[PDB]
Amino acid sequence: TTQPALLRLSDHLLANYKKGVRPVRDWRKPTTVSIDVIMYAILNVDEKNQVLTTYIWYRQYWTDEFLQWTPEDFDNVTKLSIPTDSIWVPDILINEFVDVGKSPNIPYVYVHHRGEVQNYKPLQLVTACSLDIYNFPFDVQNCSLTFTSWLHTIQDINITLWRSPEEVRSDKSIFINQGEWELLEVFPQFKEFSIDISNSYAEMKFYVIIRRRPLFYAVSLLLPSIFLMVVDIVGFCLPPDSGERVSFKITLLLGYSVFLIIVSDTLPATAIGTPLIGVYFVVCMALLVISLAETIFIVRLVHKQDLQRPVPDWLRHLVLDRIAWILAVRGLLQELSSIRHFLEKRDEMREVARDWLRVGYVLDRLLFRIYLLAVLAYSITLVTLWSIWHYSENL
Amino acid sequence: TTQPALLRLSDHLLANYKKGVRPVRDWRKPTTVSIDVIMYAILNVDEKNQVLTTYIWYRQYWTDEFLQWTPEDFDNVTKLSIPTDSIWVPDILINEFVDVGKSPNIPYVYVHHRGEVQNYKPLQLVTACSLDIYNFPFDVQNCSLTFTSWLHTIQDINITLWRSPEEVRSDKSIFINQGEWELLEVFPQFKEFSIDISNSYAEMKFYVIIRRRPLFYAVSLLLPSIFLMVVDIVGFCLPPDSGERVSFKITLLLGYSVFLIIVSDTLPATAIGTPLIGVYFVVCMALLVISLAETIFIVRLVHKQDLQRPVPDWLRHLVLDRIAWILAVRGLLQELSSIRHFLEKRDEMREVARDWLRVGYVLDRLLFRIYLLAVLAYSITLVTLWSIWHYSENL
Amino acid sequence: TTQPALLRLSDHLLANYKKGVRPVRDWRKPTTVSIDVIMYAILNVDEKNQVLTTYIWYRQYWTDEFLQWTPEDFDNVTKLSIPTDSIWVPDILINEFVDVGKSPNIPYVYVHHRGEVQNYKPLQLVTACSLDIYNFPFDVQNCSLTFTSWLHTIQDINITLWRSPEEVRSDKSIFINQGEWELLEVFPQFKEFSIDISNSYAEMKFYVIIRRRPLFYAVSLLLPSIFLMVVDIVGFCLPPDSGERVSFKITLLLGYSVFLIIVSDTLPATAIGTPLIGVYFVVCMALLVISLAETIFIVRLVHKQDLQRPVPDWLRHLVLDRIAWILAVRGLLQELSSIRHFLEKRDEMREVARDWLRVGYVLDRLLFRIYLLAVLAYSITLVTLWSIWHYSENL
Amino acid sequence: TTQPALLRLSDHLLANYKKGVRPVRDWRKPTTVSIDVIMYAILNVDEKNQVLTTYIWYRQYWTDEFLQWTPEDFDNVTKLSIPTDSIWVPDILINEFVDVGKSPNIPYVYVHHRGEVQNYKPLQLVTACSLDIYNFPFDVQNCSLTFTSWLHTIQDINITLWRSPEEVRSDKSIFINQGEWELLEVFPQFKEFSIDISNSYAEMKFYVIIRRRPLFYAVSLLLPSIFLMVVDIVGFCLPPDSGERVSFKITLLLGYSVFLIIVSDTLPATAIGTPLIGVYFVVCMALLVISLAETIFIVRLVHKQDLQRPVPDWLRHLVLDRIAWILAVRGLLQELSSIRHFLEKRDEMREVARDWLRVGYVLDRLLFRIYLLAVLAYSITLVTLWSIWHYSENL
Amino acid sequence: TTQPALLRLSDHLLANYKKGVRPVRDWRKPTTVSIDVIMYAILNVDEKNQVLTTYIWYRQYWTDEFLQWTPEDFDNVTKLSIPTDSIWVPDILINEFVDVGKSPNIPYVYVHHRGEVQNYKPLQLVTACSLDIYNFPFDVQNCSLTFTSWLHTIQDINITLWRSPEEVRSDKSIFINQGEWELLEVFPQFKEFSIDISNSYAEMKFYVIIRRRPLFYAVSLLLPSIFLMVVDIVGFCLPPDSGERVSFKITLLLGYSVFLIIVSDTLPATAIGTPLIGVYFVVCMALLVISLAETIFIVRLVHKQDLQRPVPDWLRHLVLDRIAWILAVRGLLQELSSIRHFLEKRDEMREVARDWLRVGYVLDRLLFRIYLLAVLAYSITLVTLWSIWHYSENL
Ligand SMILES: *[C@@H]1O[C@H](CO)[C@@H](O)[C@H](O)[C@H]1NC(C)=O
Ligand SMILES: *[C@@H]1O[C@H](CO)[C@@H](O)[C@H](O)[C@H]1NC(C)=O
Ligand SMILES: *[C@@H]1O[C@H](CO)[C@@H](O)[C@H](O)[C@H]1NC(C)=O
Ligand SMILES: *[C@@H]1O[C@H](CO)[C@@H](O)[C@H](O)[C@H]1NC(C)=O
Ligand SMILES: *[C@@H]1O[C@H](CO)[C@@H](O)[C@H](O)[C@H]1NC(C)=O
Q: What biological function has been recorded for the protein in this entry (chains A, B, C, D, E)?
């Protein structure tokens, strides 16, 4: 007619159309929603409140049996857009979410032909996830998102995947690669959910694989922790007996405590787990404290009237395996002989006070061995963490 | 007829239906809402603002006497879903809440048959609770949630439990066990509420039992506080008199103050209570300060012209119970005898300055006893706190 | 008739009813709103942004002359509930508020009989108040809430109190007593408000009296500040002259600075006032600094060639009131006499360097007096603050 | 008639009334909005994000030519209130704003007579402003608010002031004077805005004058910075040469660094400017560092084998202007003479090591002069800042 | 007619007008939206969450074929404003955004003539961007904003630029120049977007060029880092051998660590990059630590019984290139000769302990060379960063 095609097509469709009833002619046939997920960016991974922020491009389609027309009647048009609030829209929600509402709504949907309705929308999802930092510098996380209908059972709503699973697994078309986390794989999975003997529901789980970039954390933390070899080589060659070691070890302890003072403002906080690097740091702290204490005992003993046991019961264990594994003229001469002792009184002080450096080292040597074993353990665990991080790129 | 069943059933029901009036044919019969609560996760327990964040799956049903139909008239269908905003929905609210609004709405409800209407919805509840941290590492909390109608009295609205109470007590089907707090029991309870002589209301209280996981806090706090035995064994065997103790005790005091500097960033803050562990920490601080002061007095006395009272009035109390519980030739000889005194002047300095180590220990020994009693008290209170924590799993 | 009573009663009332016009038959009679306030909890008192968060149960009623019916016509029912958005609701707002919107709405109101309409609603009020912390540990606050209509004058809207004032003064039926602040009195007051010569408005002020619980702040702050007697008794009996005091006072200054380092994370921050306890703390700091400086001068003078003025002009003021208020044989003997002076050269060093401890104390004694006066002032002001806090419970 | 007056008056007005068209009979006449601004409180001045929070009581009126009636027809009533959402309301917005939405809406407006419509509403405005802290303790700020229509040009909407400008300049009727900032003047101003050659817009700028209260900041910051005279008088009279100054200056440097450690938690942060007081503080820090360094050189030189140049090229400049601006008997006697040198070897050590205190002071005296000039500059700039602050109350 | 023109024109237009259909008579012609962007202010650049906050004045127009009229029929009016919610409005969104919703809506649009509809609105955009701080003090950022339709393809919606590109490039008419960042260029760009073989979309990218103001950061950070020349000139001229250097270098290390303690509260935090200035700071820290260690070895060696290798294998490399690139009378005489050795025993101690200052400097000199090279590198990199910053103003 003279009326333009789109206006009278919308009049023919939307008038005498009841939004709020499931668009099926036979109620025994469930409606099928085919959803798709495209990854855009990873905005934040809190790893203290166990929640991550993500931004996802989302689309889905279903069949609306009451929106059908013959094209050549309405001037041969095969697609139009009508407002979302005037048709039936299913309720698809995420099971795990903390706060949603910063994602806007799109008030337009295509109704292509034969009832094909398509919805395009962005998503600002803040979803709870179980984030572990056991291997902090080299983390690989394994988070899930579940799509389902909160009310409709599987006899009313089915969920299917839009594309083939392989395309969804490797889809990095619009991802931002200038952040901190690197996307690896989005793995879809279908499940039937039921926690009671009456009703069952359809779910579509998406597993998101992310991986940290360790360069920043390596150059900012590991090399100052490589300085344990510096402290070892400055504490080894320096005389272990009374000298400047006590003071210089104290200064290095203050420095290595200032380092962990700075580090605590950068390492993540979590109330259920701690990084293994922190375990190695506190082990190094304990060994430094025991080293300082042992140096204090050795300094004190050989300079404050050493009365150590010559042959105590511990000597047997000391020697069993440690040495294997690791008129007035007469009065004038009398007083001259009496005052001649000043030379001895000036000389016999060092010989008194320089006794037992030999026995003091039996503990410094063992503690040096402990330092080297600790450093070797740190190196091997760092290498194996890097290996586990690097082998995760196969998926 | 030719019209499909669901559309004309919705037309028959919703047309000439007035939302806003209580759906009863006789106004003397109150409507009964049967509610249920399923526990999902404990997102946050603030324990500083006395509020916890929780996520609960919720459902309820009531009877709508104006939504009834004979199935075989409408093509034998016995269930349909209609929008929530087109029927009467009761107002069930939580008495204690700080901020709600991050939980979305579900715009669909089943109207099964004979007026059975079911509502399914998630809940993001941020509810105030009285959280105590007296036994911080081993806490067991006891929080409540109250469901009632804010306007309708008990003559208009009754609240009943959906399932049997035993099922609600032990329902951990969908709980997340990868967090910090562990769920123990959800105990329902019915009460009739009235704060005036005219109106009474129906409530349904739910008591949520949670329990902290102490592993993280134990390995991160207790063992550095186990190092009090390290400080005791390094302060005992080291000479108590003038030597290196003053300085070494000062260094340990700086270290044990750095520890509580770090701890204050991890211990919770509350303006109405403090953990008992903090009480033991400050007691240890006070004892360390008194030890350092006593060492300073002992160092000062025996090296700066000791003029202590030989037999003061305190000697009686010192000995009563402490020792039980715990031509020119003549001038030449004259000047030789005069200058012979240099040996004595060089020798009689140590004997002057090494007087009274015996009396100085009467206080170091007692203070060592005080340290051991404090450590024993710490150990026994830690054991009893763990026992109280472990016996709470029976419920 | 056959139609049930509630439905046709709602039809008779709400149909041909215009929401948006004040429900009076004669426009010269103002409508009267009778409000009531019940106290539930005090969620937060910020005392840095001068705002407090409160939770109040609220109710009010007015007369709607267009909602009237004869009961026995409509099957003898004398109460019903109708949606709030379908009738006229007055605009009652708080004058002082920072952010509202976290309190939900109740979409139901009773219309009892003869036009009696009742509204029940919770309130999440975040209202600005003038909070002072002059007596921080023992605060008693005096905050107001004002209820009025923002547009309607007193010729259109009147505000009256629901119950008698005495009941509102003492109403602690549902208060939570497990928080930090204690409720004392809610005092209603009526006022007529007008800031221009044309229009006047009706207000209903509510004064909320709250009171801090000082136990936590006392046990956490006062006793370490009771340790000023510890520092006084360790600085008094220790020799004031050159010895270990300079160093030990330095150590106590570092400790008493670490204390205020910790305290600054717990004391409240306010840009218009400071607690008097902080004034006493900084006075103690200044006195400690002046003590350390005076000890440095006394140490320096009596050990570095004292050339003080014997009788300067200050001696008169020093003594006026301070002492009241507070062949070759000849050469051989010659060289022997020359070398005999070594005894004097070894002995006359202490006598040179031990001059004037007597004059040094004239300042240490006065400064000790200053410490005791400062401690007495601290004690008396703490006692009077506690007395003012305790006498406030009469109201 | 029998129908009450207000209901049929509202029926006569609102029926057949089209909201959404500008209420003028002739479209060539712009509508005039007469606005007013009343100041209530200044909630926050961020001075780090360059934004302030304000609370303003607001009102405006315009003429609605379609809402007119003869009073004696409708029972002689000359005012009524009708809902805001049923009439035409202009769009008046602030040009500069960061976040609005915490101010509620008032759903009622008076339509007095002959089309006089009045709107009363509160405002929660968070507006960006250029805040400078050059004179932090004594700031006077100069912030603007602009009211205009975002779409309608001046041919459609005009903005006029309700009252006379003088009344708006001095209007402190409802201001809260218990905060931090003091209101001085609200200066209205009219401008015609146009950034293109086609369209012009009408604006009404309001300049808000505020002023800080300096008491808190003075008593909390200036007096500890008055202690520079304390450090000057303790560093002047103390011997400048080797003694206790190096150590005592180090202790004062640690104290004066602890002071600025505390201050950094209270001084405001701004990325475009710094207070001049901070400049004086860092100048004092630099002068203290140079003083400590110069003392170290002087201590080192006169005690470690001084080999300074006697007459270098700098001596000319040193003296030009600085001094103006500022058998066996023979062997027995031989060995006696040889050993007689012990007296000289014991005596000639001080005379060697006490050389050149005279030359060392040439730098300490000059640096003392620098300290006094710095203190004088600090005092004069503080006085002039106070004078500028005090003279701002004339407006 | 008697009815005023605007009311009946609005009646003629809006009645029988269907909002929700694209306003084209022929559906094969896409609608064209001509957009414009005007820059107002840069509120925040987070550079830790990789997001910036911006405020933009925005406008656009399109053609509405169903809103057309002949002017002289409706009393010769050629423009009117009608509510936005009563006509068709396209959906133009930004691809990258984190949170929107603090920008209000303007419920009025001009419909000029022949279907010309204009929309004016402000925008509060919080958009994600890739912010780098490699050259922190002198940053130039390069951020994008993309405008497109989220649903409509290019066959339905086209996007064109309102003005010429040159005007948009240089448009600083209403910019605020009192902030931290300086606007340089807004560069528009058109692109056709398609990530699939079926649908294509039209985009309009806007590149926003901003530039930091370095004055504040220069005066607050660079000059204290210019004090490395102060530390170099106080560590060079001071004797490198045993003396006061160890202690004075320790004090400078504590000062230069306090500086970076203060700096960490002002430097930005980013998990993907670090400023080069921080790299130079940590290099200076490492060199200071190695200097202190080398001084400790040199102090220890020449004072604790030096037993260094005289001619080790390292001597060849030491000398190859380093020196090029950089009765009783007999007994009386016997005892006199025996006691005559006291002079030698008092004299031969310094000569023993003053051995090898010559060899110790071979490392201090090299380390001084390292300091000068580090300072030169710092200066040249600062100059080149300033040059890159200054040359960016050409665009
Ligand atoms: C629609 O298709 C028919 C048959 O294929 C064709 O004749 C007609 O031209 C098409 N519509 C238009 C508007 O061209
Ligand atoms: C409904 O039930 C009747 C009787 O049980 C049965 O005959 C009929 O087939 C059922 N409806 C349908 C659609 O099959
Ligand atoms: C209402 O009151 C009348 C008279 O008191 C009484 O007869 C009647 O039974 C009452 N209504 C009902 C439903 O009982
Ligand atoms: C309105 O004014 C008229 C004339 O002044 C007066 O007679 C009449 O009484 C007034 N209306 C009422 C309701 O009194
Ligand atoms: C509109 O234009 C016509 C012809 O140009 C003119 O005669 C008429 O006066 C104009 N309208 C009005 C209201 O003046």
A: Forms serotonin (5-hydroxytryptamine/5-HT3)-activated cation-selective channel complexes, which when activated cause fast, depolarizing responses in neurons.
A116 and A247 assigned to the same domain: no
Task: Tell me the HSE value of C325 on the side-chain side, using a 13 A CA sphere.
Answer: 12
Separation in Å, CA A236 to CA A240, A243, A249, B332: 8, 13, 11, 59
Q: Which two tokens stand for residue E118?
A: 């204009």
With a 6 Å cutoff on the Cβ, whether B73 touches ligand 2 is no
Mutate to test the interface with A, among E64, E141, E151 (most CBs of A within 10 A): E151
C76: left (phi over 0), alpha (psi -120 to 50) or beta: left
Are D114 and D242 within one domain?
Answer: no
Q: Which of B272, B273, B335 sits opposite C340 (nearest CB)?
A: B335
Question: At residue D393, what are phi and psi to the nearest 5 degrees?
Answer: -85, -5
Distance A199 CA to ligand 2 centre (A): 22
Show which of residues 329-348 on chain D sit within 8 Å of chain E, judged by CB atoms.
Answer: 331-332, 335, 338-339, 341-342, 345
* Cα torsion C62, C68, C71, C77: sign: negative
User: A144, A179, A212: which is the final residue of a domain?
Assistant: A212
Which residues lie across from B161 on neighbouring strands?
B35
Give resolution in angstroms: 2.8
Q: Is the CB of E76 under 6 A from ligand 5?
A: yes
Give the CATH number, domain containing residue B69: 2.70.170.10
DSSP per position, A246-268:
HHHHHHHHHHHHHHHHHHTTTS-
Copy the structure tokens of residue B182. 């562990």
Distance CA D47, CA D50 (A): 5
Q: Are B215 and B223 in contact (CB under 8 A)?
A: no
Q: Which domain holds residue B77?
A: 5-213
Q: Are A110 and A121 in contact (CB under 8 A)?
A: no
Strand segments, DSSP code E, in chain E are: 31-45, 51-63, 81-82, 92-94, 109-111, 116-128, 140-149, 157-161, 181-193, 201-212
Total domain count, chain C: 2
For residue E97, give Cα distances in angstroms to C297, C370, D156, E143, E158.
67, 65, 36, 13, 22
The reply to whether D204 and D227 lie within a common domain is: no
B202 and B265, same domain (yes or no): no
User: What is the bridge-based pairing of β-strands B81-82 and B109-111?
Assistant: antiparallel
Dihedral in degrees, nearest 10, Cα atoms B258, B263, B266, B268: -140
Cα separation of B140 and B145, whole Å?
17
Q: E206 with E140, same domain?
A: yes
- E251 and E390 in a common domain: yes
Instruction: Indicate yes or no: CB of B272 within 8 angstroms of CB of C180.
Output: yes
| C197–chain D Cβ distance below 8 A for any pair | no
- Paired with C44 in beta bridges are C53
Domain-ending residue, one of D189, D213, D237: D213
Number of residues assigned to chain D: 395
- Which tokens hold the place of C263? 């305290």
Of E335, D352, C299, which Cα lies nearest the Cα of A337?
Answer: E335
Q: What is the three-class DSSP state of B196? A: coil
How close C21 comes to chain D (CA, Å)? 7
Q: Both E166 and E266 in a single domain? A: no
**Residue ranges of B 198-237 with Cβ closer than 8 A to chain C:** none
Ligand 4 pocket check for D105: Cβ under 6 Å: no
A200/A338 same-domain check: no
Contact A67, A9 (CB under 8 A): no
Contacts of A248 in chain E (CB under 8 A): 296
Identify whether the C-beta of residue E182 lies closer than 8 Å to the C-beta of residue E138. Answer: no
Q: Is C48 helix (H, G, I), strand (E, B) or coil?
A: coil
DSSP strand E in chain A: where?
31-45, 51-63, 81-82, 92-94, 109-111, 116-128, 140-149, 157-161, 181-193, 201-212
Q: What is the CA(B79)–ligand 2 centre distance, in A? A: 15
